[PDB]
Design a protein around this ligand. Sequence first.
Ligand code: ICS
Ligand code: ICS
Ligand SMILES: [Fe+3]
Ligand SMILES: [Fe+3]
Lengths: 477, 477, 522, 522
Amino acid sequence: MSREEVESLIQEVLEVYPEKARKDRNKHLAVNDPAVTQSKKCIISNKKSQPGLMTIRGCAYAGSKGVVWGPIKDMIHISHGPVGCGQYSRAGRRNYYIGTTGVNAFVTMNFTSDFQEKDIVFGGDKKLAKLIDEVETLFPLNKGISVQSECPIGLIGDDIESVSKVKGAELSKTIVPVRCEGFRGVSQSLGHHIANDAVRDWVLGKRDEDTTFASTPYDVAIIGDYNIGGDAWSSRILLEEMGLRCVAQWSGDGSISEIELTPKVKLNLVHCYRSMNYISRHMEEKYGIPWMEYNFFGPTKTIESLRAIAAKFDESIQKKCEEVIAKYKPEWEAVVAKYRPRLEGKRVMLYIGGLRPRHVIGAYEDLGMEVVGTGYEFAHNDDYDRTMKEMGDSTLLYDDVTGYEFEEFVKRIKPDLIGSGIKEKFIFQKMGIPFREMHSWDYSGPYHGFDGFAIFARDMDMTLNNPCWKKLQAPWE
Amino acid sequence: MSREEVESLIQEVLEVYPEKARKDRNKHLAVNDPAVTQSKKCIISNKKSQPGLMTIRGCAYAGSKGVVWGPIKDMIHISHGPVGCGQYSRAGRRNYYIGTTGVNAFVTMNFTSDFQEKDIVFGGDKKLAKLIDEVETLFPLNKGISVQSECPIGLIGDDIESVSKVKGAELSKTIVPVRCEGFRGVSQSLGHHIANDAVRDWVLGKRDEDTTFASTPYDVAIIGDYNIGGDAWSSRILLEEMGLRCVAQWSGDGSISEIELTPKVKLNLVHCYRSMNYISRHMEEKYGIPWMEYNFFGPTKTIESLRAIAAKFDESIQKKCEEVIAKYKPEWEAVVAKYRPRLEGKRVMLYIGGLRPRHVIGAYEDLGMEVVGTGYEFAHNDDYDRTMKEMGDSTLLYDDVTGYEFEEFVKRIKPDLIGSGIKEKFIFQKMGIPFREMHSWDYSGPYHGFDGFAIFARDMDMTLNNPCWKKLQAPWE
Amino acid sequence: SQQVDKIKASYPLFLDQDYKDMLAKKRDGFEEKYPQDKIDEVFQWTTTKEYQELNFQREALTVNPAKACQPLGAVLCALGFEKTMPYVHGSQGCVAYFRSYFNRHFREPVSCVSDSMTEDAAVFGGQQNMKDGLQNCKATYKPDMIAVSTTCMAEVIGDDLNAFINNSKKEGFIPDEFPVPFAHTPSFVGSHVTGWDNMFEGIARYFTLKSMDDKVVGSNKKINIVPGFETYLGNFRVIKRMLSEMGVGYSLLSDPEEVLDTPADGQFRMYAGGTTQEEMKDAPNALNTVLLQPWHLEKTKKFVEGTWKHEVPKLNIPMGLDWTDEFLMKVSEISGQPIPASLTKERGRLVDMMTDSHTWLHGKRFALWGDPDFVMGLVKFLLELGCEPVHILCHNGNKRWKKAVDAILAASPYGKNATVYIGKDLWHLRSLVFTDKPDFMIGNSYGKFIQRDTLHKGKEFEVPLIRIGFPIFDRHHLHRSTTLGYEGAMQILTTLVNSILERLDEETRGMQATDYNHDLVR
Amino acid sequence: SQQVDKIKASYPLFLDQDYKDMLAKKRDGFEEKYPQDKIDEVFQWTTTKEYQELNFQREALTVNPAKACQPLGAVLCALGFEKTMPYVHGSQGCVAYFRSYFNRHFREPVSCVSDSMTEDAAVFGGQQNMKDGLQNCKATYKPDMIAVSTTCMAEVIGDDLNAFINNSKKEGFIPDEFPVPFAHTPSFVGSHVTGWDNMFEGIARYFTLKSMDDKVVGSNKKINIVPGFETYLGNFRVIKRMLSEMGVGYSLLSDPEEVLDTPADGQFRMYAGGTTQEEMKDAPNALNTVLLQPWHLEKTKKFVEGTWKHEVPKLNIPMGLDWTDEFLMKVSEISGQPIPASLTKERGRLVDMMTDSHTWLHGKRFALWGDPDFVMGLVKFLLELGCEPVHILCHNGNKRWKKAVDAILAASPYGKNATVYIGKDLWHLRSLVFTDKPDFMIGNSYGKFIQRDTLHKGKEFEVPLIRIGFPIFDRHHLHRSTTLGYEGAMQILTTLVNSILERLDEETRGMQATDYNHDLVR
Ligand code: ICS
Ligand code: ICS
Ligand SMILES: [Fe+3]
Ligand SMILES: [Fe+3]
């Protein structure tokens, strides 16, 4: 499809909306022109969703509890409020970790205050203090507590910061109040920002006066890698083969101590800009730690990122980087030789959260695959600025796409594969279009690094070329 | 009911038969009169089955391969002939053993010559020799081979004795030809006799000139205990707590070496008289080893048997017998106290093979239970002589009962429980009558000894008092 | 490293030596992990009776609950009506979570919209959200009905749904005749089943309250069936099948079976099947209304008995032999239809399976959890099978339900060692299975974690999980099963007995150690 | 010792210290056992490729066969006719074994009689046995029909069944009009499925051969369905249900579903349901005859095509998506009935499940065995699911069937690493799963032993068994499953994917070792 056909498709899809919704939604759909750079020109993002249009967006609690704080393994995260929010987010995200669950790690557990009517009417501060006492009694090896606010907490006037301060002083424990009520912001993104501010205010500066950490000039911290299916581990190994010492992982398989040790590193390697640029900029301002974005999706991006990271260090790190690249060249070359012939020319449409809609493009192009449509749930204008150069000409860009919009776009564009979340998977599987979960990796992965690239190619091939897709039409129809 | 009602029931059941079948079957049904203990007066047994009347009897191959030879664990037993007989008898009998299956033990495996048409037409002796070679190649740790003849072997003129002799001389291997063709005899009993003769002629006298076995005055063998669900083990422990050394077990968990060592024992303890009295009498005649029958079903019979066995030895064995009885008295007394109140007065009908229809009566009476009907598939007149004193007055005795006969008897008598084989279980379960498998112990057990008595009481109670038996009639009928 | 011909996913890729060394370096350098002996000591402590005593003293902390919030049940109830859009007035994160939860359980699309109430609506209400959302939803997805529930944010700020919808119709955002039933579903009251009950009552009231004058009880010769919160498609199907077998005219109100089982034939069907508006309007004309899950249909029962004038029978959930029998007899009495020969044969076949499997089922100890009606039906069936329920947990149960379940247990000698817990979560149950170990658990997927914990104590301490209930996330297509009626009883019986036999096979697979009992025939 | 409160069966009673000590004393004193290191060495040797080369050189020895003898199939076929007694002329031990085998598989009564030929009949024949047996069976069990097969003794002896039955009727032992169909079923030819084929051909010949003059093809507007040797009740039921949904008139010849599923209601029914004699007599008037399992219905096909003049369609077993589609389209063409919307929806739901589970099913390696038609249907469905059949074993297969299965494998890229074995037994398959390890086995209960063997090599070498086929002895009520049609495909798919997921959960249950991949959602 040419640019004119994409604009016409956008207009026909928008036709059914009421006038106000049509006017709003027109700002969130665009045809990519990599000849320009500004997102103040084509796509408006980070706005509120139109009511009743089946947005795929989550809330700030999902962005804070489910994304940033939840993966921190040795901390206990209290879903403060009614039972639902904690129950629906329990173990739904594959932020992998090593630990003894219920003893020293608590990632897949659901801790909640389980608000009843009396907690709504008379407040929940005393219940929160009692809850913290009970947590201390029953989980003595927890290294800290976070209190993730659900919607009612901010509406009933509860003061979780005072309880956090008093209980933390009394128990000599880090207790982090997070005001991530779901009605704040417009998506998970404000949850990211609130969680980052909570880290900055309650955890990050714990060891500011401490100087007993033996630091090396090769100290780095992986920021914004949540170890989905082991992704961070598949990244970390490469960074440690390059001669770097990864001091912290934020926050997949992350501990509170390594978060506290982050201000001691020489470099902050930021994978997910969207969720962690706030703390990266803060650490740059306060501790003078530079941060750089990197991409470990596919061999081309991984090699570029490894070289760019090694260029921040001495010649020994650069030599080790070349050694790692030489070591892994045959592996990913074999992966390409095996899977690119079966994926050449296949067209993909992506709809993911804040980072992956542009980050995984390089891996698809490494497999000979073309991304004809991409979009974000909750990205900001800077993410679209980054996306414009990563995306091909006359390709479709969508922000906060409605279910109707996405289904119509797929009906017209007819991609060979769709990469998106669980709420679109079965819709597009029923239309006979191969679908890949690009949040959970369809319970596969990791996809980061070379080891992840092998799995990514295998998964894309197994879903796109599955025999089932040829059997949706009955032979008598 | 009274004796007259039982005779009337017998006559009404018999009136459906044709004249010849009626005349034959009248000789196999009797009303017990324990005052008169002659099986030449009341019941005729060990006769051929009437054609087309659904006998429960098996064949001589089942009596030899399935019963006597099969349990011998370190031997490989070839089902010589077509595939069926070996396939249907594979692992159908719970003759328990310890060993590494396929390496040094072969009980649950099915070795067969798998006769085709050409083997029927041109014979199978060369195929048998080739098969023995292949057995030697693929199972080098086998300590002997038996060749159990199926029906066609004796009809096509095959000479398995010559092959056995030649191959055994060539390989320095004990190769035992067993002429247990299913058409021989009338039931499994002739299979017992043929297998016993094969043991006597090919295995038992191996160490006649050997005197390197260190023998003690307390040497005993367990003959005719096939370790069903571990029964023999539950017996053996008691005998070894009494100070006796059990040298051989025939043939449950039995090895060929311990069979060869049996002529060195001081006493042969025969549990199953029916299947092993031949070899017991032979060992008495040749080696002068006395043999005695014993019963380890239930505490009363077990205590009586232990005292009778200890009376064959010195005073130390008798003192150890009293110690064993004192040690186990509280356990079986607790079993009785728990289960007899729930089983008092319950009426049982039994139909089993050659030994158990009379041997288990003591355990039922130990639980306060009354056996109102019993009978055998293939017992001889001596078994009925032994049964007459074990059974109550005016109780029903049946030999080679037909399915119609057993169903009609159960309809009239209305027992609280039936103990029989797999071919009666579901028939009587569908009539709403609790059923216990008295061949396989319903995949439970052991039932021998005190440890077995606990399980026996638990099983009888769980089946007789199950809630399901109160639910067969729909509430709207 | 990866071999191109044998590619490893996370398991077992991270068991490789290089990954193991890297993880050990991470742990030893930067995690500041507690020493492994201390971790083992604390785990052993958590398995003990003293820890259980501390655990059951909890008053404010809930750990691993077995329940959801009301709007989930409201959405599931709304999904059972023809061309009906579930519409949750409030925050969009709730709708995202509801849809993801139901997607993972059913492996099907779940359509539900939010009006995306933000921080400004938290000050002056979500009236504008309601108007724009109703208009946008009707224009875009073209439902015949929009069924409105609430998130906790809308409940806390006190949004008046009735006034908002009336103002939406008054100002032309939606037509005045367009059906917009609503229910208040506060997440801090009850659970998801309470939300189902509230939503169903709201819909029934919307369609019948103002038109009762011309209604005559029994005029349409049908029986109303209210299933309640149900996540097995087989249960809807089996109720319909049994009623059709009897020739009983019926109206299954809130039937989501079709929309949760759409075929994959090249097109996406947002709506499929469901209770029609005509059926709900004609419902008061039925002979009676039968509540399949009466312990979370109390408000529906009050409305049906007080407005429709239906003498709702006192029936337990038709689970297991006795309660299926009672259900069929009551339906036969209400409709006048005799119980047919096919249903009698099916009952007899269930009884035959019970007799076939009783020796393996007898005396087995189960810890179970789930929703109240489901849990008591499972307890009743287990008692019928000679099994021993030991730990009966219902996080969303109440005192009256506990009294009824205790009465059920008292009627059976197999309920002697049974304890019923209400308001307890799965951490409590983990303590219970550590301190009073059952043979098996019966529950949803969350119990898998308990199994892991028990296995960490030892293989002999491991309590295997049997996945019956909601949600089931780690197995595929179990939502197609049946738990109701004779068919559901047969499925449950087969699951239980074969779980027992699979465990026994695992325990006796050790060659020359336990394989003497590795029987071919069981 | 036994604690009265917790009574131990054999497992784990014999794991107690006293029993362990006694068993060790037995072994060390009298068993003369090979040293344990030698046993381990021999086991490891049996796991290797050299042992497999020796294994596949076997010419005379068969170890653990995967087939039975003809009269078993003859008895199963005879059980499918109304009030019909299976009568095996020959030795009674065979009948005892057949009944025990079928009892253990079906957990139901199985009625069959023998005429108890003994050693005297080995010289004179079984004529007297036949006369007396037919008279006694008719008098006692009152069948409407007696279907006669043979044991190997009668076949080797040369008993002429036709002459024996004719003499029985000539001398007044049975009425001349009483139906006594017969078949020669030599156990040294073919297998149990061949016996089914012979018995069905004998019955069809008995009822139709002499009355073909007034027959007109297609006069009764029905389709004959011959199921063949079938041990899943669900398969009979699903064929009947799909044909009824299409509105297609059908006659299921040899339908044993009723007599193998009698209810437990207080009475024993020896006979139930079954193909009536009138249906068999009217069978040549059908439009056509469809053979559900053509690879063991060759004699039946020859008779139906040569005598009834039915143009039997070339149809595979209706297993899996493509072959169920082909079966339905052929039935639609023969009957003129369109395929209804319900069947289209069912097919679409099967496709939905396939898409839901393909990521877990893709690339999984399966060894499998069973009867020819069943095995090729399973292979076809596995290829449809993106699975890799690697070891395809059929003990009773032939060269032509192997050619057809190789053609099926060649048509799919997922059949590249697939080998078909005919005439090989389960010891051969043990070698194959040790040397070229698959992910799973699919077969009957005998495969459990292979699983044990593999586990003895190591946990990472263990090949779990999936029980689909005949016989299944160590699980309860699996004979109620379906393997045919879309319903059977859904059941098989669910079994396979959940077996995979259960294995993954077991492998990832190790706390702090592999539980990073112990995902709640799969
Ligand atoms: S944190 Fe963000 S929606 Fe950067 S909230 Fe979301 S585990 Fe997505 S595109 Mo789920 S900004 Fe991570 C994300 Fe990306 S949960 Fe994961 S996949 S790279
Ligand atoms: S050997 Fe005999 S039929 Fe004595 S052939 Fe049979 S394992 Fe029975 S009554 Mo099955 S003479 Fe043993 C017997 Fe008794 S197989 Fe077992 S239970 S005590
Ligand atoms: Fe049964
Ligand atoms: Fe689906």
